[PDB]
Amino acid sequence: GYTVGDFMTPRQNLHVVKPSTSVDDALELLVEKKVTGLPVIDDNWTLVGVVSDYDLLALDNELQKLISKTYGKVVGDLMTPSPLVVRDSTNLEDAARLLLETKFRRLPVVDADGKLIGILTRGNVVRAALQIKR
Amino acid sequence: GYTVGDFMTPRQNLHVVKPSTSVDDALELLVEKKVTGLPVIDDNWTLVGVVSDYDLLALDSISGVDSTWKTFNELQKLISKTYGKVVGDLMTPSPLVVRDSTNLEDAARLLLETKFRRLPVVDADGKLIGILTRGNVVRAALQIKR
Amino acid sequence: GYTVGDFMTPRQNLHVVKPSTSVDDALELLVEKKVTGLPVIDDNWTLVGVVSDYDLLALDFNELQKLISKTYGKVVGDLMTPSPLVVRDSTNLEDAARLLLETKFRRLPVVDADGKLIGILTRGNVVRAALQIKR
Amino acid sequence: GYTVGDFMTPRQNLHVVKPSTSVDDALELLVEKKVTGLPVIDDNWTLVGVVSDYDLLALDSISGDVDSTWKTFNELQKLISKTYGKVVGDLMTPSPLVVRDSTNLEDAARLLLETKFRRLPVVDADGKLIGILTRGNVVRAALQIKR
Ligand SMILES: Nc1ncnc2c1ncn2[C@@H]1O[C@H](COP(=O)(O)O)[C@@H](O)[C@H]1O
Numbered sequence: 001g002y003t004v005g006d007f008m009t010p011r012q013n014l015h016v017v018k019p020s021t022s023v024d025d026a027l028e029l030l031v032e033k034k035v036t037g038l039p040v041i042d043d044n045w046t047l048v049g050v051v052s053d054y055d056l057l058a059l060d061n062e063l064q065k066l067i068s069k070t071y072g073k074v075v076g077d078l079m080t081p082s083p084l085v086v087r088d089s090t091n092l093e094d095a096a097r098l099l100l101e102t103k104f105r106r107l108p109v110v111d112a113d114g115k116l117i118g119i120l121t122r123g124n125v126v127r128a129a130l131q132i133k134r
Numbered sequence: 135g136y137t138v139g140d141f142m143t144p145r146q147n148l149h150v151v152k153p154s155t156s157v158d159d160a161l162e163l164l165v166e167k168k169v170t171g172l173p174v175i176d177d178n179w180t181l182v183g184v185v186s187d188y189d190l191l192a193l194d195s196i197s198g199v200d201s202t203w204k205t206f207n208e209l210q211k212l213i214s215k216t217y218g219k220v221v222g223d224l225m226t227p228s229p230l231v232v233r234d235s236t237n238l239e240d241a242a243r244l245l246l247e248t249k250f251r252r253l254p255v256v257d258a259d260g261k262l263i264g265i266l267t268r269g270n271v272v273r274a275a276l277q278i279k280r
Numbered sequence: 281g282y283t284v285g286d287f288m289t290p291r292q293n294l295h296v297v298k299p300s301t302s303v304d305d306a307l308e309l310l311v312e313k314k315v316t317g318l319p320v321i322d323d324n325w326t327l328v329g330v331v332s333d334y335d336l337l338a339l340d341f342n343e344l345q346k347l348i349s350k351t352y353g354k355v356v357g358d359l360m361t362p363s364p365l366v367v368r369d370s371t372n373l374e375d376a377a378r379l380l381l382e383t384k385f386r387r388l389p390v391v392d393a394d395g396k397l398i399g400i401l402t403r404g405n406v407v408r409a410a411l412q413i414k415r
Numbered sequence: 416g417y418t419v420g421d422f423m424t425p426r427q428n429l430h431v432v433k434p435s436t437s438v439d440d441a442l443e444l445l446v447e448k449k450v451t452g453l454p455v456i457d458d459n460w461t462l463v464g465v466v467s468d469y470d471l472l473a474l475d476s477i478s479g480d481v482d483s484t485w486k487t488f489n490e491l492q493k494l495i496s497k498t499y500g501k502v503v504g505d506l507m508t509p510s511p512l513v514v515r516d517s518t519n520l521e522d523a524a525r526l527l528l529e530t531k532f533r534r535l536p537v538v539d540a541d542g543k544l545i546g547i548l549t550r551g552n553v554v555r556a557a558l559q560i561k562r
């Protein structure tokens with residue numbers, strides 16, 4: 001019965017970044033807001049990626065050298081493009097099944113134009129089950 | 135030259151549970167204490183499992199070719215997490231663990247390999263002495279910008 | 281222009297087990313002959329399974345779980361992976377190498393037209409082939 | 416009660432190579448000594464990598480997710496390096512997962528089950544190579560509990 005929209009971390013609570021955001025600033029934001037990942041959007045709040053603390057932890061012949069010179073600079077290069085995402089209308093049980101299958105920490109929630117309206121974490125879902133039981 | 139002990143959340147600060155603990159209690163404990171997982175210990179403080187929010191996601195309330203043996207086994211485990219009443223039904227028993235004296239970067243590479251949110255830290259008696267999370271390692275990373 | 285048949289470990293060299301072979305027996309065979317896995321055949325040498333040192337390593341509602349414990353994990357037939365990925369002696373060595381790369385499997389059993397075990401192609405076989413050929 | 420050290424292949428029995436070891440030398444070695452992989456060390460016997468028969472399978476002469484930009488570039492360039500490598504450095508996995516000789520055997524065993532690796536190189540406190548624990552060593556250990 002319940003939806004993603006019911007229990008998702010609302011837009012107002014999100015710590016977003018843009019492809020151009022420096023990897024060091026994403027790192028610092030991540031450590032300071034004590035989150036485990038950051039959604040990535042463009043200037044019109046279209047969701048373009050996700051950057052996990054996993055990605056940052058992973059970060060830390062001529063081809064290798066020219067690659068090293070070019071990346072490890074901006075979120076845009078470190079982010080997983082085209083993330084798996086749900087709708088606010090997506091049924092909550094269904095979403096939880098998606099978390100179970102993908103093992104992802106979070107499923108960003110977008111509208112029909114791919115704009116970022118929320119994030120559904122594991123925490124969201126278990127808290128949900130709790131508030132419901134209560 | 136740093137180790138797990140330098141950044142692990144220490145024993146006193148840990149929120150633990152036991153296999154006998156009810157699913158309701160552990161859920162309440164995760165959500166109230168805003169943690170993503172809990173170590174599972176016996177009465178002697180011996181680390182016997184880890185239970186993660188991921189494990190909770192399988193609950194009937196929340197959601198919903200291999201050998202004959204592996205198939206049956208997997209299904210029995212699925213039924214157990216689906217209708218589990220105590221932590222023991224849900225946890226992953228015998229977790230991968232590290233020592234306080236494990237080189238920090240080995241722990242990091244273990245976290246990269248396994249993708250686990252956390253590694254329980256035990257002494258040589260297999261007693262629970264801490265928890266190193268991905269967040270701790272990343273915060274160690276930043277904190278060594280020095 | 282090299283084939284699996286050229287470099288596989290032939291049938292005559294193989295240590296096999298049957299689905300009725302006890303798991304403990306298989307464990308002993310594996311250790312004693314120092315191999316990492318065993319092909320499983322029936323009485324007519326039809327390849328019916330693979331059982332790996334991995335499977336043995338792994339195997340080493342309380343009531344249901346118990347029942348499952350007693351009923352299975354006794355013989356190879358319940359522990360083997362059924363319907364293994366296999367090749368033919370005519371399979372190009374490069375395609376087989378590439379299948380080893382894709383699947384990460386230690387061995388591809390080699391079977392004839394009737395599905396009878398005639399060999400095993402391991403990573404070792406492929407690496408050795410590369411040595412022998414280079415020379 | 417058993418440890419990795421109880422069943423590992425010890426330092427004195429190990430076949431090893433370096434990053435600068437040529438692929439031909441390494442392959443020859445694998446074949447000749449009948450092992451499925453080689454620890455890679457530097458001049459001070461610090462463990463710096465592992466090269467496996469798996470890694471040699473990628474060689475041009477043998478076999479010829481949707482991720483971030485960085486990761487994809489790395490994966491490709493690593494694939495090219497393995498395909499055309501001349502030295503072990505081009506093929507090896509650097510910084511492998513490792514255990515201590517005093518690591519409990521069952522913990523090592525569980526690590527082998529989770530990662531599916533064929534072997535865990537065994538190092539001392541300073542990262543020097545002191546052994547190799549294979550899957551085979553573990554299953555043998557499992558049999559030794561015939562007692
Ligand atoms: N919703 C998502 N869709 C696609 N990829 C994701 C998503 N969430 C995380 N990832 C990626 O999956 C990996 C694991 O991230 P995490 O789930 O945060 O541990 C990282 O490489 C992330 O960038």
Ligand SMILES: Nc1ncnc2c1ncn2[C@@H]1O[C@H](COP(=O)(O)O)[C@@H](O)[C@H]1O
Nearest residue numbers: 184186188226229230250251252253254
């Ligand atoms: N240190 C660990 N060793 C073994 N399994 C684990 C460990 N940590 C978590 N798990 C399990 O791995 C799955 C994902 O947990 P998490 O790491 O919290 O995403 C769940 O089934 C956990 O019970």
Ligand SMILES: Nc1ncnc2c1ncn2[C@@H]1O[C@H](COP(=O)(O)O)[C@@H](O)[C@H]1O
Nearest residue numbers: 317330332334361364365385386387388
């Ligand atoms: N050729 C094969 N076809 C299908 N499954 C296999 C094959 N070889 C191994 N397996 C299974 O894959 C897993 C890994 O085996 P191994 O490749 O021996 O590490 C074990 O469960 C094996 O039983």
Ligand SMILES: Nc1ncnc2c1ncn2[C@@H]1O[C@H](COP(=O)(O)O)[C@@H](O)[C@H]1O
Nearest residue numbers: 465467469508511512532533534535536
């Ligand atoms: N202990 C280890 N730590 C990290 N990577 C490894 C380890 N052992 C093997 N690998 C790599 O994993 C792949 C499979 O190797 P194998 O375990 O020989 O099948 C190869 O790319 C190896 O280089």
